[PDB]
Amino acid sequence: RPTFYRQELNKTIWEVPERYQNLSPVGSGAYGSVCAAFDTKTGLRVAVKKLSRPFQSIIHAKRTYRELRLLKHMKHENVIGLLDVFTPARSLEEFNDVYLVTHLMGADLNNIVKSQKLTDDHVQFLIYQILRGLKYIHSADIIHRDLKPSNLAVNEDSELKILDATRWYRAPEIMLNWMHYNQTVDIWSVGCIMAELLTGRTLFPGTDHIDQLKLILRLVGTPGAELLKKISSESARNYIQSLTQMPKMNFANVFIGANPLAVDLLEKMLVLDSDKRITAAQALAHAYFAQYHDPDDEPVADPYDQSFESRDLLIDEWKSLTYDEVISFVPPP
Numbered sequence: 001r002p003t004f005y006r007q008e009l010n011k012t013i014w015e016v017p018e019r020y021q022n023l024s025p026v027g028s029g030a031y032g033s034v035c036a037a038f039d040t041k042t043g044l045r046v047a048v049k050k051l052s053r054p055f056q057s058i059i060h061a062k063r064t065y066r067e068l069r070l071l072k073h074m075k076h077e078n079v080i081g082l083l084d085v086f087t088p089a090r091s092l093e094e095f096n097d098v099y100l101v102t103h104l105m106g107a108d109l110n111n112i113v114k115s116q117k118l119t120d121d122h123v124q125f126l127i128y129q130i131l132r133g134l135k136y137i138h139s140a141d142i143i144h145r146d147l148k149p150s151n152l153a154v155n156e157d158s159e160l161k162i163l164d165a166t167r168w169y170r171a172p173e174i175m176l177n178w179m180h181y182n183q184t185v186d187i188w189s190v191g192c193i194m195a196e197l198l199t200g201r202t203l204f205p206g207t208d209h210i211d212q213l214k215l216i217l218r219l220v221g222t223p224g225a226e227l228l229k230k231i232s233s234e235s236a237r238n239y240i241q242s243l244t245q246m247p248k249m250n251f252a253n254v255f256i257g258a259n260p261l262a263v264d265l266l267e268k269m270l271v272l273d274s275d276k277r278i279t280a281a282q283a284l285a286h287a288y289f290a291q292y293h294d295p296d297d298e299p300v301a302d303p304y305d306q307s308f309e310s311r312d313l314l315i316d317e318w319k320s321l322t323y324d325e326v327i328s329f330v331p332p333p
C-alpha cells in the first residue's frame with residue numbers, strides 16, 4: 001500500500017498515492033472532479049477523477065459500480081479506460097472514495113477543431129478513430145447514446161478516445177422517443193460530427209427540440225413507407241404524418257466540394273431508418289478510410305456482462321461489489 005498524501009484543489013480534498021504528483025484541476029468541472037497529474041511511475045500525464053459521493057445511496061453506489069465495471073472492461077486505443085483505480089481506504093468499512101486514473105488527453109474535439117473545416121485527410125483520421133472505438137464499444141453490446149464533441153477526448157495530435165447544444169448530435173429516433181433503438185444511434189452522431197468537421201458548421205443546430213427534428217427531417221426526408229410500417233404507435237404515426245412532409249435531399253448538393261466518398265459515407269450514416277444505417281464495422285471498411293483501415297487492427301471487446309443492471313441490491317452490497325473491483329484491478333502493461 002503506497003504512501004498517500006492530501007491536497008485541496010477547488011475546495012475538494014484529494015487523497016492520492018504519492019505516485020501521482022503535480023495535481024491541477026482540468027475540464028472546469030465539465031467531467032466531474034478531475035485533476036491532471038504527473039504519474040511518476042510512467043512519466044506520463046494522467047487524469048485522475050474523484051468520484052462524487054459514491055456510496056451515499058443505492059443509486060449512487062450502483063452508478064459507481066457501473067462506471068468502474070465499464071471502465072475496467074474498456075481496453076482499446078480509442079476508448080477511455082483505466083490506468084489505475086485506488087482508494088485511500090484500507091478496508092471495506094473505511095471504503096468511501098473511489099479514484100480513477102486514465103491517460104490525460106487534455107481537450108475535447110471542439111477545443112482541437114475550433115469549428116474550422118479540416119482537410120479531408122484530417123477528417124478521415126478523426127472519424128476513423130471514432131468508428132474504431134465505436135466498433136469496440138458496440139461489440140461489448142454497449143451503446144454510447146450521447147456521442148458528441150465534448151465526449152471525445154482528443155490531444156493536439158488529434159489522437160482520440162471516446163469518453164463513456166447538447167442535442168445537436170442525437171439520433172432522430174431518440175428525439176422522437178421511439179422505444180426501440182439500436183447501436184447505430186451512435187453512428188448518427190458520428191455522421192453529424194463528420195459533417196461538421198468537413199464543413200465547419202454544425203449540421204443540425206436546432207434552437208429547441210422541435211426545431212432540431214425539423215432540421216433533421218429536411219435533410220433526411222420524412223419517413224418512407226417502409227419505415228412507417230415499423231412504427232407501432234398510431235399516435236406516433238399520426239404525429240409523424242402531422243409534420244411537414246419533405247423528400248430527402250441529395251447529400252452531394254449539401255456537402256458541396258467534399259470528397260465524394262465522404263458524401264457517400266454520410267449518406268449511409270445519416271439514414272433516417274436506423275435499421276438501414278451503416279454499422280461501425282461496416283463504416284470502417286468503407287473506401288473513405290482506405291488509408292487507415294486495417295481489418296486486423298480494429299479489435300473487438302470481450303463479452304461484457306451487464307446483468308447487474310437488472311438487480312436491486314442494498315447499498316452495502318453495491319459498495320462491496322465495487323470494493324471487489326477495486327481490489328481485483330490489474331493495470332495495463
Ligand SMILES: COc1cc(SC)ccc1C(=O)N1CCC(Cc2ccccc2)CC1
Pocket residue numbers: 026027031034047048049071080081082100101102103104105106107108109111150151152153154163
Ligand atoms: C474530453 O476530454 C477532456 C477534455 C478537456 S477540456 C474540454 C480536458 C481533459 C480531457 C481529458 O483528457 N479527459 C480524460 C479523462 C476524463 C476523466 C476520467 C478520469 C479517469 C478515468 C476516467 C475518466 C475527462 C476528460
